[PDB]
Amino acid sequence: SEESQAFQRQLTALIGYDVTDVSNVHDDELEFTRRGLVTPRMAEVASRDPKLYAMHPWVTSKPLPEYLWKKIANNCIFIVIHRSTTSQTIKVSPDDTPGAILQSFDFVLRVCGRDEYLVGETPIKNFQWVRHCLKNGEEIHVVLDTPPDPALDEVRKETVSLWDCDRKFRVKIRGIDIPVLDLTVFVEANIQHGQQVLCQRRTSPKPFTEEVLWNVWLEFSIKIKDLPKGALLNLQIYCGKVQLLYYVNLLLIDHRFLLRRGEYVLHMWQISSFNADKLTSATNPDKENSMSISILLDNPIALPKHQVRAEMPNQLRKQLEAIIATDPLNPLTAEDKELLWHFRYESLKHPKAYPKLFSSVKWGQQEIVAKTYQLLARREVWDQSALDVGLTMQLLDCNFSDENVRAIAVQKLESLEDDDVLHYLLQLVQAVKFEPYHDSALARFLLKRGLRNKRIGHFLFWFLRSEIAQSRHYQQRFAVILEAYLRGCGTAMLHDFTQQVQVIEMLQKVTLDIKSLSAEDVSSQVISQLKQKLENLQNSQLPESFRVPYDPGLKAGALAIEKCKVMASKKKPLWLEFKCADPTALSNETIGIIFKHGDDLRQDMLILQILRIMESIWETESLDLCLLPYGCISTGDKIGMIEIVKDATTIAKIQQSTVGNTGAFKDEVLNHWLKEKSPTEEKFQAAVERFVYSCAGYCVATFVLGIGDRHNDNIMITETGNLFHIDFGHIERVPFVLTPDFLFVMGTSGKKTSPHFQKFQDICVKAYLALRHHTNLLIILFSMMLMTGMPQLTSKEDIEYIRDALTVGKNEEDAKKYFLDQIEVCRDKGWTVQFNWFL
């Protein structure tokens, strides 16, 4: 090809990884998966509606919450429509479709300021933009526009069976080789299914020289026929009690159902328990620095494909139901497992048993797996059950290495409306890390949902890009998936993405480079160089405009160079501000972005995403808690962008402005800072109200996530009362932050109970118990968040935190008093922890 000369090179610049490269493989799975994904791409590319894809209307089908109906004025909402200069307002009823607004005099209603549209056979109350304008209390400003051309979305034209082998499995350990290094070393070969170790053998310990040869056949007790698809040969290196130093993996049954054979020279990863990177089929690309193991597999041999009780004692049925009932983090004993397995079919009638049930399968037995597959072909009850994401997630996590088990989870995700895919996208993307193969139902599901929706597609991109840039363990796989998406998203977005990448690489350089200029307190000279470079950048590199990666509605244009700065901070982040590229954007507010190196923002992304989830949980119960989960995209290695939240300062700086440094903390400061930012009493008390919700939200949220105890230049408030935590990329005590200054805004002091503080407790306990009505879901998101986002060798102990936090097994009454105890610890401690942070 001759125009693939541009296209492929263009794809590599957009992906941030050369997909075609085969220097770091030992088989052809990645290349296979590229080819295997063409079909699911062609299928979505071809079946999606050209025009709806072009306008990507962002819509929901949940009920309009109680808090937003109470904001409707006599079943009528106002919409302002703009032509040239002149515009006029129109009365509308929540049920009005855009078409039923068009004939009210071919064009299309575009939102003012944004690349957001109000088109399609859904009521106007069902568009998120409208729901946003009610949320904050804004008028809906639209523009009579001609619909964008689908031609721009155009997509460029593109011999013996296994269950007959009764011989025991064995692998030759030839030896190991470190290029550069006084103890001893041995090799541990685990046959793994999920996190479960089926069989384990060791070499005898040898002296640890830069080369160690064993030449030994490690014979296993598991038969070849007893190997299940998705089994991992996990080779590990310990030294000497012992210590794990290098790990590496190899699928025993490969992507064409063939049993793995022959000579392998695999490069291994170092160490710096439950951790997604520990499961990777990827080899270490650093050939020169890293340790490698040499092995031999020999005996082709292929794995094939296949083609009742329900009357139990009382004591037994209950014991089963007690097991089904326990949380996702509860250990199943041998007794538990044997019980679930025997009552297989009774258990199948309970969708909630599924995780626990398929955790009872002895995957090291061919016949058992067969019975399991029999069982899965009988899933009417499952197939009929209403979607449960908490349940669906549990089956996609690290404890399930089975294509068919995982398929049934992805089956349920199929029914998510595009709104919920956005809510779970990040976590789903991360769950790809648990998939035993590069091609899987989960990867294809993300592929096609991404292709069907420019919004899911846009974030999909950034999420895969984020990992490709900083995970050697999973860049190859994500790269394959992203290339797949890119070859289907259509020229328009490829042009968008291209612009987006260029801009952020221009700016990352200006961050990299500026950071270097400062001895750790802003220099006078650094202002010269920054403002020079930002002018020197706008001259001949920055485009007329680019999409804001954390908000793809918003196009950013020229820089507000005058307003750009670098914080008095040790990580020297950039404070950039951009004019909106949209003339129709009847704002004047800039678009504010922070660029920061030094922090791992993948951790922020994860926590922020969880917060958006807690929000929608609250929505199901008609609660609003006015969390502020600001946009934040990680783009590379310890570097990314952060939404600047307009009119907001930190609690600490409010303490630093009235009292000064060495914080002799005063209580009245916040309340009269608020007062002094409020114009009227009306807008003041609304701001105090917003604070009661804001505070309680972040109280409940931070405690549950165990990130509650915080230094308070990490808590921010808007001039309109909105409290919100920031910089999550960090982590005697305190459950969450509820200081005398917050309490005084509520109207309390030391030991009292104002009208608002009662409401605070009321709102708290409601929020806390609402979360508990999704215990299972939060537990799994938290587990998954730890395993894929926080490198820490994260243990059971780390994860068991949220069990306690959400007081599992406890009744509603008992937990309400648990949470109220928490509040009272904060009441009791006052300024102690805050003061203690200082040093």
Ligand SMILES: Cc1c(-c2cccnc2)nc2cc(F)ccc2c1N1CC(C)(C)c2ccc(N3CCOCC3)cc21
């Ligand atoms: C709090 C604050 C502030 C700040 C703003 C108002 C009052 N006091 C401090 N200014 C900054 C200016 C910069 F150029 C860079 C960073 C900050 C900054 N930080 C520090 C840090 C940890 C990098 C950070 C992380 C998130 C945020 N956000 C602030 C914008 O709101 C969304 C998130 C700010 C800051």
